Amino acid sequence: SLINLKIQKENPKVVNEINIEDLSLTKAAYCRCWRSKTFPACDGSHNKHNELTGDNVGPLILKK
Amino acid sequence: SLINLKIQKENPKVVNEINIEDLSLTKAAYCRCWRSKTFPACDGSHNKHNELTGDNVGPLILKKKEV
Ligand code: FES
Numbered sequence: 343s344l345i346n347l348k349i350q351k352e353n354p355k356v357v358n359e360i361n362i363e364d365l366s367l368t369k370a371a372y373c374r375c376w377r378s379k380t381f382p383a384c385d386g387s388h389n390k391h392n393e394l395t396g397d398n399v400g401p402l403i404l405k406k
Numbered sequence: 407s408l409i410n411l412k413i414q415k416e417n418p419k420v421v422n423e424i425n426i427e428d429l430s431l432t433k434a435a436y437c438r439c440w441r442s443k444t445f446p447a448c449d450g451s452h453n454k455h456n457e458l459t460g461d462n463v464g465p466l467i468l469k470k471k472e473v
């Protein structure tokens with residue numbers, strides 16, 4: 343079954359690049375659940391996904 | 407439907423941290439499909455998943471300029 347239900351479905355492979363030199367924040371979270379409204383950033387939508395499905399997914403956190 | 411089938415299912419929420427200071431490469435791919443054998447790194451397993459399911463997932467690429 344699908345992982346990504348709704349993000350950029352016209353794109354055959356969704357890849358996001360992060361320019362580390364330009365990170366504003368000392369802690370930044372990136373989505374690994376494909377539900378975030380701020381994708382590729384994590385907005386906490388994983389929590390709802392985990393509650394609905396019994397899953398245990400969470401973000402990748404970059405630290406300065 | 408679950409996204410993560412096999413990674414640390416005993417862990418209530420799988421979170422990975424990257425310290426930017428430790429990134430060795432100019433380009434490093436991190437997994438967003440939960441199929442990589444090198445998770446949290448991407449090993450290209452997303453391509454098999456996309457072919458099998460009709461999905462369109464891919465990695466997060468961290469780009470670091472050569473000093
Ligand atoms: S919103 Fe997707 S991992 Fe947090």
Ligand code: FES
Nearest residue numbers: 437438439448451
């Ligand atoms: S192996 Fe999961 S995004 Fe590449």
